């Protein structure tokens, strides 16, 4: 029995950019010139708002598949199968599983009109959704996905899953202890594998890094002259006659508009990539977790038996 | 029911607006738009107002932004003031009088500055009575290079002297000189003929410009 | 080499305009623990911003933080339903500006309710606003109904019908 | 009250945004009763209203110094003709 | 305040260069059913044309 | 609407600039208008390309659902409705499928 | 010298209002009556 880890990004940090403050600071003279450039600022704001609502939709689609919050029974005996590493730990206030805690632990620009918006779903609520999915898949099998949750002993569910991959259920019933031991050993090795190899969680981290880099670039591009005498608007205003001030301010306007436009275009492309990843994650949640998949290599390597979700910063494992 | 809007814009022409309306009480609710009546081309300044009795509802106006609705007659039937309440602001942002359920990013909150501070350091005045009123400015080929630093730069003494044929400031606005602080000041004093002054300017090329003194 | 402008007394923890030796800006001046070497005063950060400056007359390091700012969002039901609105100042503590403090920002015009409903209008980190019976109420959104499956070692559930 | 047409542009079934000197909505108008410094500032524009019927008010005066020093503006509305003079 | 140049007969339903009070353009002129108020002279649509 | 923007020029109308301004100094204002309008077109085309990519992804998903849900019975969970899939029926809709 | 409106197209174009400003200045000061030109007449006598 092999337990493999597949890490998929789901959402990226939501950013809102204030066109007027980024491109003109606190000066009305600059804003007057910015007004006649057209409707670029509102276009950028609409694009960013669309990205934010798309990220919220991605998280909701991936994690909120189940409609009822299922709870594991207090007596955690499942025919020798140990789910403590994936089930939530009531001792810690986060109500997160040890694997979830390890993933969470492993994974100013604001001053110029750039803001980060909180996600709609908190980490606690995503963990609660994951715990509901785990409780459903442990107590009810695949029945809760396709309708009302139907009680079934876990060994019988594993026997049906064995029948799904073309293996008779007596193979499970005469080897239940060995199967449980193999599953427990694999689950135990998962945490060590995640801790030892940082390249496994490199996807999600990369996502975060990218956005951070992008934001930094914006701030750095506030220091560019763009052919003007100075990059500071107040210096030009308190140093120049209004006409030459208009000329220099217009140069800065062009530079900062093109900066924001490049940022927004890259942001939309990254949002499309994250949306594709989130659609794949939702499909995996529906097929790997809420049922047994006959598709080869879709749910791990080998004949698929089952799958368990785990919340991760901006992703699902 | 005798609405009269009077404005005087230097964009210098006056404008008068009027509309008569049926009325049963005092200033009622309604969006009866005032149709401009006259646009007299007068150009003298106005700062007062008086009404001749043979009631009196004076109301001052301020720069604001509005959203106006036109029906299928070219008539304004409704309006929204984009600075009255947040609902009107989100109506103006959405460009629709009916706003659906949701959360809308409308404007930005800023904390305005309370007080202005200058902390310029202290007493010593910069030598300007030496560069000017020196009784000899030498020549254009041998012009005096005077270094000015570590002092109070008072440019009023420059204005105190005779009217200037050409007092032209390039990088700095002439009016805003006293506000700015400078690292080092150089005075370049000489005497040249009148007709060659125009050629002494940055970005301008000429015989006197290149063979005598090139900024 | 500065010009004639009589210095004004220094202020603390106030959004003020400052003109220090030609450095013109708007911000809040606070005591800074930064240890400037004697060289000069124009301290700057990674964001290419004049984070700190040393006062010229009295050699003390003052950090310049930007004046508080953010975005305002209007939570409203349908215009036909009601004209009442709530205002969310995002990223701003309520002290700076029916006042409730969410992790998304300061939410004015809405009343917090302990009971949890399904999300109607998103606000932020688990908080949703709704127009319920006749005011805007903010609540921690409910993920769903809590159901416990009666799991036993020898019990199964089998359907008797279909839809 | 105080909404007017900004310019001579026909528009049908449209919402148009105008940045112009307008009387702010729900503002404090000073209602003046005249019983038989009485001058008022002009600022950026003035809104006048009157409910009179028997032509009690018949004109206006605009100016800066209100004497022979500076050009004035006189509007008189008699029963048959409006006369505006900038003498 | 217009000028020497003279007032050609109004040609309708033909792509004709038109100069109305200094406003120059290209297009066909057709009978208009919209009811202008006495005061306006220009008409514009939602696209600001 | 971007045709009404001045883009730093005196007027947004090219005919007005031609009638009023002299060629050597009207060229720069015409260049301002040209660069503004070209940027507007490029922004439109880039947004259009991104939206076209999104629509292509949606259409590929719709084609897969038509092939699997309609022309067969799918054992994939939640791909064809909620529950155990029996069958599916396509219906045309303006610019889409139901 | 025409700055804003080309001399050739004066006849065709229409204008809302015309304002005539008549004065007397020296021959070399005529160039000072032009946008972007600095001089005694420009700043202390008549500013465009
Ligand atoms: C499950 O494993 C943990 C450690 O991995 C162990 O402490 C616990 O006792 C196990 N559960 C059972 C029922 O033995
Ligand atoms: C009005 O204009 C005149 C001339 O332009 C000017 O002298 C005066 O200061 C202005 N203001 C007032 C209140 O008269
Ligand atoms: C308000 O919240 C902000 C959050 O960044 C915090 O920095 C600030 O100290 C808080 N102020 C008070 C008085 O709670
Ligand atoms: C199996 O589950 C039932 C639940 O009713 C429990 O009573 C029983 O003790 C469990 N078996 C073991 C070995 O704990």
Task: Provide structural commentary.
This is part of a larger assembly, with 7 copies of chain A. By secondary structure, chain A is mostly helical. Helix content of chain A is 54%, strand content 6%. Chain A contains 11 helices and 6 strands. A 3-stranded antiparallel sheet of chain A has the order 1-6-5, sandwiched between helices. In chain A, strand 5 and strand 6 form a beta hairpin. In chain A, helix 2 packs across helix 11 and helix 4 packs parallel to helix 8. Chains B and D meet through strand 1, strand 3, strand 4, strand 5 and strand 6 of B and strand 2, strand 3, strand 4 and strand 5 of D. Strand 9 of chain B pairs parallel with strand 1 of chain C. The structure holds 2-acetamido-2-deoxy-beta-D-glucopyranose (NAG) (4 copies). One 2-acetamido-2-deoxy-beta-D-glucopyranose (NAG) binds next to loops of chain B. Chain C: This is Spike protein S1. It is classed as viral protein. Keywords: EG.5, spike protein.
Q: TL;DR?
A:
The structure is cut from a larger assembly and holds 7 copies of chain A. Chain A is mainly alpha-helical and 317 residues long.
Main sheet properties of chain A: 3 strands, antiparallel
User: SS-based structural class of chain A?
Assistant: mainly alpha
Beta-sheet strand percentage of chain A?
A: 5-15%
Distance between the termini of chain A: 18 Å
Question: In angstroms, what is the radius of gyration of chain A?
Answer: 26 Å
Q: Spatial order of the strands in the main sheet of chain A? A: 1-6-5
Q: Write down the overall geometry of chain A.
A: elongated
Q: Order of SSEs of chain A, N→C? A: EEHHHEHEHHHHHHHEE
Oligomer: part of a larger assembly
Total beta strand runs of chain A: 6
Number of helices of chain A: 11
Helix proportion range of chain A: 40-55%
Give the names of the bound compounds.
2-acetamido-2-deoxy-beta-D-glucopyranose
State the largest interface: B-D, 65 and 62 residues
